[PDB]
Amino acid sequence: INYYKDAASTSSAGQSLSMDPSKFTEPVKDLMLKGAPALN
Amino acid sequence: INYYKDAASTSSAGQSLSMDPSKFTEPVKDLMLKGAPALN
Amino acid sequence: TVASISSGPKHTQKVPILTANETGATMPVLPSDSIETRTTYMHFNGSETDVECFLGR
Amino acid sequence: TVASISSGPKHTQKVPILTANETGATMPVLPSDSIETRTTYMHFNGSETDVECFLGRAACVHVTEIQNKDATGIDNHREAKLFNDWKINLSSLVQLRKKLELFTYVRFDSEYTILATASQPDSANYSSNLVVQAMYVPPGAPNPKEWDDYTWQSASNPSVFFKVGDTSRFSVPYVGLASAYNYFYDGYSHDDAETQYGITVLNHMGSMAFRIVNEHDEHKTLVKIRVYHRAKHVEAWIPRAPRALPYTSIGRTNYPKNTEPVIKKRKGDIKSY
Amino acid sequence: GYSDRVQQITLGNSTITTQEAANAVVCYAEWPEYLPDVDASDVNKTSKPDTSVCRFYTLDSKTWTTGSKGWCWKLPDALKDMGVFGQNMFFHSLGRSGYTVHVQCNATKFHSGCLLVVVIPEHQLASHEGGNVSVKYTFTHPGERGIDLSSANEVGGPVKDVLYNMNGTLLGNLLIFPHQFINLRTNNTATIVIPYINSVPIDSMTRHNNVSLMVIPIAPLTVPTGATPSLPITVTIAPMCTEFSGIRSKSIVPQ
Amino acid sequence: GYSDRVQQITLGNSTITTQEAANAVVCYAEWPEYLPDVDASDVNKTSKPDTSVCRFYTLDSKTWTTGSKGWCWKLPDALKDMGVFGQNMFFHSLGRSGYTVHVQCNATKFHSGCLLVVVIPEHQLASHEGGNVSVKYTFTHPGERGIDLSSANEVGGPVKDVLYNMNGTLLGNLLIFPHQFINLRTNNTATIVIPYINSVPIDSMTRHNNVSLMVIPIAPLTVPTGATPSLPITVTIAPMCTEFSGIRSKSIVPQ
Amino acid sequence: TKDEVNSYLIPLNANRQNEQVFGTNLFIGDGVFKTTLLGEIVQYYTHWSGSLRFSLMYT
Amino acid sequence: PDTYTSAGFLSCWYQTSLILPPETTGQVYLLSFISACPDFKLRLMKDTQTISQTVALTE
């Protein structure tokens, strides 16, 4: 129950439960498959 | 939920969301169209 | 809500920027009447300028 | 969810453990690519590492102090700590600062808690009960000059009145001018040859002025204000390397000269355990 | 017969071929794109010179020697004088751009050495003075020359200490930023595509640089016996999806 | 209430309003348009800076006095230094453009005078020396200053005799070219839209001017009694549908 | 030097050519703008965004 | 007024020049107005520097 009118006044947000490290761990242009050779 | 009986005791009103500047910006008797000459 | 529409070159007989202020009106001229604009949205309602808000603290 | 699958002997032409790090990727290698594993489940979600959780607890962001005393003959209230302002910041006490600067741009609502306690360091008959006034002074508002100016009327400026010993709590929406806040900014306010670098006006979260509403009693009373800040509704972009050297200034990246080695030297060889 | 190894990038009227690449990085897995209306604020129609600005400019070459500490360029600064890109830059109030960065360094199978090529969004430098000394404008706008981390401290300039990234963080952790290594034994180029990253939809190109490109020797250069002890490093960079807006008189900037 | 008389032209980030126009001429009844593929030869994609080059540049003002003979500007020369139009010009090998020309001269209902405003495609000037003396480059590239037909013969310059249009034809017949009069009693501006006219699809902007704009007093200026005897004439011109192609190093031209 | 009806009037000189009639920066919360209704309201708020309409009536 | 946040300049020049009819003389004036387009946004209310006081008023 929100007792207040504005959105800033609500409690903390709830877990992204998004999670996708590939923008950080695999930003390569041509896709690399694990097990296939790195450099062909 | 109002806890009180009288109307003065309720919280602030809620946004007019009315908004019509023409009583102030265009109080002319004969309607002016933008693009048409001001004085004919 | 659009804050500005897209508008391009103009070569008209219809000039929205020439007016006669002696009339007492403020003609509703916009950026797109005199330069070439691109679309943009307002993203805003004018909530905090409502008189209830202005006199309500 | 499985944390590890079962995997047995391998004799392949398909080697997942040989890679080329020059590419910039971190290939997702697992225990089961190089030893024989058994199934196990995660039993865990990673709840408490969510950025909302990481930045979402109150941190002390500021300690100031004001006193209640006879202002009679004081030529400069501000200077007597008759009242005091604070331009809001999150980079003056380092604990929260290092946490925020793990990210480049950050967007959140703030919840402030203000604790005020009183001290009476010299002989008093009693402890008086003072009410503090905290005014939020956005840039362009008249700033208080005396502890009882017209400014304190605060007819258009949000202000909270609470008692010393108590706590005040309110929450302010994200007041940034841009879409997020840049705790880093590799720019200037204009192309001036001598303008300041790094410190910008899009990390301004306003500013706050404190005073005691009470007139003076016979003794003097020291009131010390602690402002706590909790981020709620957090959004963070672009992770960066954590801060290694100590901080020297609000808003610049500068570290102190003749600082000490930050990497612990081995007591022994490279070969040592 | 496609290898990760050979590549061709054609952009405008200019083409680059590498026969010894190590894939390419696209920052944060996003490719440069123009500014959508839903994200727009300024009402001005923007100018998109296209092929006259989105081509490859090769900056002047550096020389890696055994004593090198590393070099640093800022964008869009490094290009402030390249062809029509630069003119547009000084003439509009606001502009926006992504880039393709191609760093080149070839040697032989007897050399060793490894450079880190990294892009840091919003790289705010530190003053070597400490305290709250600022870093003057000119110092953070070296132009095509870039900053040479093995040059001496100057007054009003930034600190040039490599183990600290010019900001109080350790060299070792720069790997959290989009980056690629050039290991003479593997690699001979590094290519990174940079999407436009800012907290505003479009900004000023002169008062704010939005990425520093940094090339840092990490495993020292080691040449074969009686080889000349140095290799040149060349940086070629191409603006991509550039847009300029708010045209007028032509900025005048310090120094 | 639309009159032939009032008009607004908005082009780029600039707008012109006239409350005393006399219609507008569109050369040969054709409006500027880009270069179609069917007509193309150079294989290069062209650059269309759009709003950054297609706006109105106002050249410096002239002063009509009772002794004036007339002035002459060449295009694209007159604009060789205006904003990004000019940069593009020196930086590409080829370019193409149409223009809107707006000539302004206001007075009062007591003045008299009438100017001819005419656009001449391929106006090859004559040497005042006769014979086969050429007219040097600099002389036919006056820039924004234009040529002042009442200035003195110079050496290597063109002839400036008005009854002969600077080429051996009579002033009276200039009316076969797109033109408009400014008759103080009627008119206060002249506007001509110029489509691109050439025998090749695109050309060099520096070695060849494709139109001369000419403003010539024909009925002498006559001011009311004890009025100052002169009026300023202003020329504002806007490139329209401009395209540049074959970008490179940046031309260096005489003088 | 003292408020007068005359500071609302921008003067124009006959026969000058090429020259400048007036100049001002656009800090709507200060300077010329500051006492106007727009200026006066803007001052009740911290941030503004939007287009302005500046018109000149000739007399 | 703030730098980073600054909005530009507004200037006005003779394009050709003012010309008075016979029997007429002197300066002419322009009146200038300002208003906001429908585009406009204002936010985060605060107190105006345009009004202050030193003692409470009375009747």
Tab-separated table of N, CA, C and O in Angstrom, chain E residues 11 16 20 63 119 125 138 140 155 158-160 188 194 217 245 249 253:
chain	number	residue	atom	x	y	z
E	11	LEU	N	34.797	2.576	-44.842
E	11	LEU	CA	33.923	3.631	-44.189
E	11	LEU	C	34.259	4.888	-44.955
E	11	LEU	O	35.369	5.425	-44.906
E	16	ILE	N	40.508	-0.054	-44.640
E	16	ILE	CA	41.545	-0.679	-43.833
E	16	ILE	C	41.550	-2.184	-43.980
E	16	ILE	O	40.467	-2.809	-43.941
E	20	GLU	N	45.911	-9.838	-39.626
E	20	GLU	CA	46.252	-10.417	-38.332
E	20	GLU	C	45.542	-9.825	-37.156
E	20	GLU	O	46.201	-9.353	-36.194
E	63	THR	N	56.203	6.049	-31.241
E	63	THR	CA	57.320	5.117	-31.260
E	63	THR	C	57.495	4.377	-29.943
E	63	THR	O	57.845	4.955	-28.936
E	119	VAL	N	39.271	1.684	-24.053
E	119	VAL	CA	38.466	2.925	-24.212
E	119	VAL	C	37.813	3.234	-22.895
E	119	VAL	O	37.068	2.316	-22.436
E	125	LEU	N	40.654	13.076	-15.457
E	125	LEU	CA	42.083	12.929	-15.053
E	125	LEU	C	42.316	13.530	-13.680
E	125	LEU	O	41.434	14.294	-13.245
E	138	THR	N	43.712	23.225	-21.787
E	138	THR	CA	44.789	22.828	-22.735
E	138	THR	C	45.358	21.489	-22.382
E	138	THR	O	45.566	20.734	-23.393
E	140	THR	N	44.063	18.838	-21.171
E	140	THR	CA	43.183	17.741	-21.441
E	140	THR	C	42.682	17.876	-22.873
E	140	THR	O	41.699	17.198	-23.189
E	155	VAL	N	52.668	22.094	-15.412
E	155	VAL	CA	51.868	22.781	-14.297
E	155	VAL	C	50.508	22.989	-14.836
E	155	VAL	O	50.442	23.721	-15.879
E	158	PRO	N	47.739	17.062	-16.049
E	158	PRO	CA	47.355	15.879	-15.289
E	158	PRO	C	48.569	15.120	-14.796
E	158	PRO	O	49.651	15.472	-15.288
E	159	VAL	N	48.371	14.181	-13.925
E	159	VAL	CA	49.443	13.268	-13.422
E	159	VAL	C	49.698	12.242	-14.518
E	159	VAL	O	48.729	12.006	-15.301
E	160	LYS	N	50.884	11.653	-14.667
E	160	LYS	CA	51.038	10.708	-15.834
E	160	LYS	C	51.520	9.370	-15.393
E	160	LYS	O	52.135	8.524	-16.110
E	188	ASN	N	48.230	-7.960	-34.505
E	188	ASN	CA	49.064	-6.846	-35.027
E	188	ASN	C	48.188	-5.598	-35.011
E	188	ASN	O	48.775	-4.487	-35.132
E	194	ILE	N	32.951	2.147	-30.921
E	194	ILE	CA	32.433	2.911	-29.768
E	194	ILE	C	31.089	3.562	-30.102
E	194	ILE	O	31.049	4.401	-31.012
E	217	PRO	N	51.953	0.013	-23.119
E	217	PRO	CA	52.802	-1.236	-23.197
E	217	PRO	C	52.663	-1.930	-21.850
E	217	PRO	O	52.683	-1.139	-20.855
E	245	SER	N	24.417	19.720	-34.644
E	245	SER	CA	23.195	20.539	-34.496
E	245	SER	C	23.511	21.857	-33.848
E	245	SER	O	24.424	22.029	-33.078
E	249	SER	N	28.225	30.607	-35.420
E	249	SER	CA	29.385	31.403	-35.649
E	249	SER	C	30.618	30.636	-35.523
E	249	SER	O	31.531	31.298	-36.276
E	253	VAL	N	38.417	28.500	-29.002
E	253	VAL	CA	38.663	27.800	-27.642
E	253	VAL	C	40.042	28.155	-27.217
E	253	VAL	O	40.912	28.488	-28.049
